[PDB]
Amino acid sequence: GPHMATGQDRVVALVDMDCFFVQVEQRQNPHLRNKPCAVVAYKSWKGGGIIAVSYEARAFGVTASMWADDAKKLCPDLLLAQVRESRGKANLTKYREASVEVMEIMSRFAVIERASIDEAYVDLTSAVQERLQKLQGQPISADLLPSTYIEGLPQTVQKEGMRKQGLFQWLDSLQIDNLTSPDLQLTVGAVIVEEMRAAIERETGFQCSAGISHNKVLAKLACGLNKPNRQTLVSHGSVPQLFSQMPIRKIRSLGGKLGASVIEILGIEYMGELTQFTESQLQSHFGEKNGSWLYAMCRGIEHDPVKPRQLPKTIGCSKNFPGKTALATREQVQWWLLQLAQELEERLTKDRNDNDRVATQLVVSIRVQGSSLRRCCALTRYDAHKMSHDAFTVIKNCNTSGIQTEWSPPLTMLFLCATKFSAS
DNA sequence: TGATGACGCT
DNA sequence: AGCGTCAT
Ligand SMILES: Nc1ccn([C@H]2C[C@H](O)[C@@H](COP(=O)(O)OP(=O)(O)OP(=O)(O)O)O2)c(=O)n1
Ligand SMILES: [Ca+2]
Ligand SMILES: [Ca+2]
């Protein structure tokens, strides 16, 4: 009763760019705007592997992890943009720079946690308190939430009509008299996220979606409910009905083996069904941490903090060498390690200038024909010849080949990663 | 025929 | 340390 915590203490948002690499290329090439289009890496195997797809192309059934040649069979007029290729590999710099544009805008509003190249969490709790104080108690107009969905509402045959009826039901029952109402706090949060999304679009050209809720898992789930170019508020109150038919795999961290295990062992399908189990039962099946997390999460409660981190903690680059293209000579392994090391050196030097830090450890990881081995060594100089030589040094005993000159068994992946940053 | 990045476990 | 899971 009076002592049951309800996970309503924070206002958390997740902001995710719509079809992000596609928008970067459409911004640059207006001919691609408002068209079915995709971004592809490489070009020679089946037209290239699709890694991002515009919403217009999705309407034809085009997805990522399709080959371009196959996507063209579903969508003959599909337009393509190719990822930059440098030193014989895909080069994601354009997308990393576009990412910085968006992250730097978000950070003007609140401290952010960079979750991927195109999304970030935001803890808006303080910003909301402030805005609430700034508002004497004026009601919140629907005009301040022009792209917001209230999950579970309403209670019209056009999508925008539904959106508005839902929003009206929400605002008409909101208690503005109480500065401590969690629902009021989420609503103000959504006003701020409208402002943040407007600034991102105005200053970059990019559209995004967002989720606003009381923790990161519900914000992330909320974000995906109305895409593209919209945002979704998931209140604590909305959780029982939302979770009652929500497959377990949709919740962040449950989309893999653990979630599969929850479904198999407990004989359930939906997040809501977890409420029937004691915390001890879940801990017994899935371990102390996972069981506690599940017990709370199925009730809409999660305490994972928005971490104050807007820069990546590692800088890496890798290349696959599949099938017949696997690396089978030593000079080959050396040459690719050098290409990787050269890209890594460029990115590290840039990073050192921009962000006042230096990496101190080099991780080298490989795969053998059908992840292989990982070995580390000191990163003491941003020098590509030295890093590639050192990477070779620590992986060279992997070679079972006796008289070579040669590399057995052939290498199907190479990976260099700079880590353990210190201030500089 | 893919290229990344964060974090948990022992 | 090195390996594994989960995700974009
Ligand atoms: N397996 C993946 C998934 C994504 N990306 C890249 C291309 C995407 O544009 C970008 C962001 O990934 P998202 O999963 O957020 O997908 P999009 O932003 O492309 O689409 P959505 O609008 O559905 O978020 O990261 C990638 O290289 N490999
Ligand atoms: Ca996205
Ligand atoms: Ca994303």
Give the CATH number of the domain where residue A45 resides: 3.40.1170.60
Q: Assess whether A189 and A95 both reside in one domain.
A: yes
Give the integer Cα–Cα distance in Å for A212 and A122. 9
**Rg of chain A over CA atoms, in angstroms?**
25
CB atoms within 10 A of CB A299: 20
Q: What is the resolution of this structure in A?
A: 1.9
Going by alpha carbons, the residue nearest to atom 16 of ligand 1 is A19
User: How is residue A196 written in tokens?
Assistant: 């943040």
A293, A216 contact by CB (below 8 A): no
Show which of A223, A247, A271 is a domain's final residue. Answer: A247
Which of A 85-124 have CB under 7 A of nucleic chain B? Answer: 89-90, 92, 96, 117
Amino acid identity at A172: D
Q: Assess whether A119 carries a catalytic annotation.
A: yes
User: How is residue A157 written in tokens?
Assistant: 């045959």
Q: Assess whether A95 and A202 both reside in one domain.
A: yes
Q: Assess whether A45 and A108 both reside in one domain.
A: no
Q: Assess whether A361 and A231 both reside in one domain.
A: no
In the sheet that holds A37-41, the strands lie side by side as A49-53, A37-41, A79-82
A171, A165 contact by CB (below 8 A): no
User: How is residue A251 written in tokens?
Assistant: 């919740």
User: What CATH number does residue A318 fall under?
Assistant: 3.30.1490.100
In the sheet that holds A148-150, the strands lie side by side as A112-116, A119-123, A12-17, A208-213, A231-233, A148-150
Q: Assess whether A356 and A423 both reside in one domain.
A: yes
Q: Assess whether A198 and A281 both reside in one domain.
A: no
Q: Which of A299, A318, A100, A303 is nearest to A203 (CA)?
A: A100
Q: Assess whether A100 and A221 both reside in one domain.
A: yes
What is the end-to-end Cα distance of chain A in Å, rounded?
52
Which nucleotides of chain C does any protein CB come within 7 A of?
1-8
Q: Which of A186, A109, A194 is nearest to A145 (CA)?
A: A194
Q: Assess whether A146 and A240 both reside in one domain.
A: yes
Report the DSSP beta bridge partners of residue A113.
Answer: A121, A309
A128, A210 contact by CB (below 8 A): no
Show which of A247, A267, A297 is a domain's final residue. Answer: A247
User: What CATH number does residue A256 fall under?
Assistant: 1.10.150.20
Triad A329, A332, A338: Cα angle to 5°:
145
Q: Assess whether A342 and A268 both reside in one domain.
A: no
User: CA A354, C1' C5: Å apart?
Assistant: 32
Going by alpha carbons, the residue nearest to atom 5 of ligand 1 is A51
A14, A209 contact by CB (below 8 A): no
Give the integer Cα–Cα distance in Å for A115 and A251. 16
Q: Assess whether A134 and A260 both reside in one domain.
A: no
Amino acid identity at A92: L
User: CA A182, C1' B5: Å apart?
Assistant: 33
Going by alpha carbons, the residue nearest to atom 14 of ligand 1 is A19
Q: Which of A390, A395, A388, A389 is nearest to A378 (CA)?
A: A390
Give the integer Cα–Cα distance in Å for A123 and A341. 37
Cis bond upstream, residue A380 (ω within 30) = no
User: What CATH number does residue A102 fall under?
Assistant: 3.30.70.270
- Listed in sequence order, the residues at least 6 apart from A102 whose beta carbon sits closer than 8 Å to its beta carbon are A17, A118, A120, A200, A204, A206, A208
CB atoms within 10 A of CB A422: 8
Nucleotide nearest to A413 (CA to C1'): B2
Show which of A272, A287, A305 is a domain's final residue. Answer: A305
Helix (H, G, I), strand (E, B) or coil at A51: strand
Dihedral angle of Cα A114, A117, A119, A125, to the nearest 10 degrees: 10
Q: Is the CB of A216 under 7 A from strand B?
A: no
Q: Assess whether A140 and A227 both reside in one domain.
A: yes
- Listed in sequence order, the residues at least 6 apart from A76 whose beta carbon sits closer than 8 Å to its beta carbon are none
Give the integer Cα–Cα distance in Å for A379 and A388. 11
Domain containing A42: what range? 19-88
User: CA A183, C1' B3: Å apart?
Assistant: 41
Name the method of structure determination. X-ray
Half-sphere exposure of A113 (CA within 13 A, CB side): 16
Residue A193's φ and ψ, nearest 5 degrees, are -70, -35
Q: Assess whether A241 and A285 both reside in one domain.
A: no
Q: Is the CB of A323 under 7 A from strand B?
A: yes
Helix (H, G, I), strand (E, B) or coil at A84: coil
Amino acid identity at A258: L
| CA–CA distances in Å: residue A324 to residues A43, A202, A410 | 17, 48, 9
Work out how many domains chain A is built from and give that number: 4
